[PDB]
Each structure stands twice: as C-alpha cells, then as structure tokens.
C-alpha cells in the first residue's frame, strides 16, 4: 500500500511569488504522478499528469518535476485566482492513494472589515425566538474576534461563528456571527451590540441598536 | 465538453444501502481505453479514491472500504453507479465521479460531487427571516441586506438572489450546526444605499431535501 505525503497542509502566499509544493511517496512510483486543483464550490481539476506533462486549458505556470519518490508542483507567479487545496496522486499500484492535500491562500494587503447588526425580525419573534446577526465584511486576514454585549454585559456561549472561504474577486473573507436568546430574554434588554478586534482597525469597532 | 453529475438520495439512515449515480456527456465509457472513478471526501478531510470501472468491465476497490463497495456501468445510459453497503456517520461525505483514459488514471474531468449525510434524524424544512437594512447603514455609501435560513436538515440548502441576478456582493455563509441537532445559516449581499429604494432585493431558498422554498423581500 503505497502511503503519499504533502509536507505543507497550508500556506499563504502573495501574488507574483513561486510556490513550490512537495509530494512524497512512500516507494517508488515510477513517474505515475498527477496533480489536482480544488477551489473552493467548484469540480476538482487536472493540472499536471506523469509528473511533467500539462493538462490542456492549464497555463504555463503551472509545472511538476521529480522521480522516484519525490515530487514538486510549481507555480512560477502565483495568481489571485490560484487559491485552491493542492492535491497529488499516485497511479504505480492499487489502491490509488493521494496526498493529504496542500491548502494555498492569496496574501493580500490587510483589509478592516465593514462591519453590520441585524436586530431579530418582527417574523421571528412571533415564534419565541430571537437571531442578533453581525456581518463582518471583506477583511484580510482570516482572525477576526467578534464579541456580543447586551446591556454592557459580555456574552458567552449563546453565539455561533461562520467563516466564508476566500472570495475570487478581492482575495477577502467574510464572517457571520449568530447571537441566539429567547424572546423573553431578548425582551429584558435594550442595548445589543457586536464589538470587532481585527488587524486593520486601529481600535475595536462597536456596532448597536437599541429594540424600541 | 465533457460533463459529469453525480446523483443521490441526500440523507441515508446507518446501517442502510447507499445508492449513487454518475450522469455523463462528451465521451463514450465503450471506447477503448476509457475509465470512470468514484472518489468522496468527507467534510474537512481530503480525497479518497472509492472505485473504479473500465470499458471493458473490470471492476478496482479500495480495501478500506472491504466487502461494502459494488461499482456497475450502463454505457446505453452513459451511466455509473456505485453501491455502498451498511453505512455509518463515517460514510458521510461528498461523493465524486471522474473519468479517464488509459491505464495509469489521469482524471481529466471530474463532477461536481454530491452530499451524502448519514442520520437517524428527519428531514425538516427552514424559516426564511429577512436581514433588513439599517436606517443608518452610510447614507450615498453601502448598505447591507440579507436572509437568515434557520432551523433546517440535512444540508445542503439553495439560496440565490433575484433569482440569480444578483451575484456581485453576495456572501452564502456556511451552515453552523445549532445546538437542536438543525442547521441554520445568513445570506447577505451589500449594495448602494441610493438604490435600498428603488430596485427590489429579494432573496430565493430552496431545501430541496424537504422541498420548502422560500423567497422572501427583503425592504428598509
């Protein structure tokens, strides 16, 4: 049973760079070595088949070299829409094995997220239910601290995080922050408001509303 | 030009048979040479090759899915299937199809993947609530609107903007799983304020697992 490693789990790198991704073989594989491409809600792609050759439709930048048990995935200059988990594959002995895969991120300058409070519809209190939303949008990097406070009073284990992946257009992320109380709490208070710690703001930033 | 889609009952209680399906255009599995491939990848994880079928019929599994794997063709149908027995919450992934040509496999062309979650639990419709735009979001700036799809199962849910018109500013976040055991997620898009207004914002969800659609307005 032929075992494949990727060195890398994940990486950033800026555009413009050469990045350079390792693929090792437990023995020989006699050059039976593709690479795969897998970019976020899209089919996975061939990139290189028999260590060296070109998937047709792939640009030049991308290459694959080695022998043996040692292989590398290229990228001369990394593109913004190059963003993708990096995947390789033996075709030496059954069972076909891959790679753990190589996450590769765009670095890009840093962005401060625009940040919004959704206060819970008219709709959803009607059911005894109440969803305080705030939208963190468009920041580099990825950390981000979101903190609740209602009524000047932090909040702890009553909120949920969801981080989308690297956006195709801006190399951005976007994070969504669910605040969940029942309406009988949710009545008891006025002030509700996310506080967000990122690396382009200069000072936390505040965003409220008060239910009446 | 070559197309494949994968097919699934969505959700499978364990202990059950699984029953999945390879839909293909562009290329003939009777050609000399040709080959299709299964290959799943459970949430977080990476790849994993299943099975595998040529033209001529014979059959490749992977051991560690022993005795529980059944790949079959229909080249009249341009159709692979394959067949997983006795499934458990290990079994939940996403499933792949790819093809290839000659011995050793390059997969050339790969589908989309279909979702596969492996539960006792029932299927259950969402809630659709609008994200309404704040009074003060930045007065001839941008203003940020949206949906929250909540308390759903299994994944995954369908959400879409004017019917698919509007795509530019949009964020799907991914599904959290809430505490109940049911999934809910936001949708949101930012747009310019002087526009809150006078172009209409409505937001379409589809759970295709229970069927419940939604569309719903959303207005300042």
């Known amino acids: 049973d032929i075992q494949m490693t990727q060195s890398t789990s994940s990486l950033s790198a800026s555009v413009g760079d050469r990045v350079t991704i390792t693929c090792r073989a437990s023995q020989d594989i006699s050059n039976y070595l593709s690479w795969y491409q897998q970019k976020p809600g899209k089919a996975v792609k061939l990139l290189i088949y028999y260590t060296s050759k070109l998937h047709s439709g792939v640009p030049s930048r991308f290459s694959g070299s080695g022998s043996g048990t040692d292989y590398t995935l290229t990228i001369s200059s990394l593109q913004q829409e190059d963003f993708a988990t990096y995947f390789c594959l033996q075709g030496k002995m059954l069972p076909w094995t891959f790679g753990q895969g190589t996450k590769l991120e765009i670095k890009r300058t840093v962005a401060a997220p625009s940040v919004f409070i959704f206060p819970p519809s008219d709709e959803q209190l009607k059911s005894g239910t109440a969803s305080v939303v705030c939208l963190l949008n468009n920041f580099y990097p990825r950390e981000a601290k979101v903190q609740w406070k209602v009524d000047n009073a932090l909040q702890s284990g009553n909120s949920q995080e969801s981080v989308t992946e690297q956006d195709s257009k801006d190399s951005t992320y976007s994070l969504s922050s669910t605040l969940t109380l029942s309406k009988a709490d949710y009545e008891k208070h006025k002030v509700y408001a996310c506080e967000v710690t990122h690396q382009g703001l200069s000072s936390p930033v505040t965003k409220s509303f008060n239910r009446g | 030009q070559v197309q494949l889609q994968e097919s699934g009952p969505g959700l499978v209680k364990p202990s059950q048979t699984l029953s999945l399906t390879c839909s293909f255009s562009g290329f003939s599995l009777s050609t000399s040479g040709m080959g299709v491939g299964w290959i799943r990848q459970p949430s977080g994880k990476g790849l994993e090759w299943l099975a595998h079928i040529w033209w001529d019929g014979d059959e490749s599994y992977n051991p560690s899915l022993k005795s529980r794997l059944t790949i079959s063709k229909d080249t009249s149908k341009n159709q692979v299937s394959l067949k997983i027995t006795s499934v458990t919450a290990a079994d939940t992934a996403v499933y792949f199809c790819?093809?290839?040509?000659?011995?050793?496999?390059?997969?050339?062309?790969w589908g989309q993947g279909t979702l596969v979650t492996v539960s006792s639990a029932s299927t259950k419709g969402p809630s659709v609530f609008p994200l309404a735009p704040s009074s003060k979001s930045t007065s001839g700036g941008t203003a940020a609107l949206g949906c929250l799809v909540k308390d759903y199962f299994p994944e995954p849910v369908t959400v879409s903007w004017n019917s698919g018109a509007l795509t530019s500013g949009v964020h799907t976040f991914p599904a959290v799983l809430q505490s109940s055991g049911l999934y809910s997620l936001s949708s949101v898009v930012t747009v310019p304020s002087s526009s809150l207004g006078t172009q209409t914002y409505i937001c379409n969800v589809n759970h295709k697992p229970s069927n419940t659609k939604v569309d719903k307005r959303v207005e300042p």
């Open positions: 790819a093809r290839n040509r000659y011995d050793p496999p390059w997969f050339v062309d």
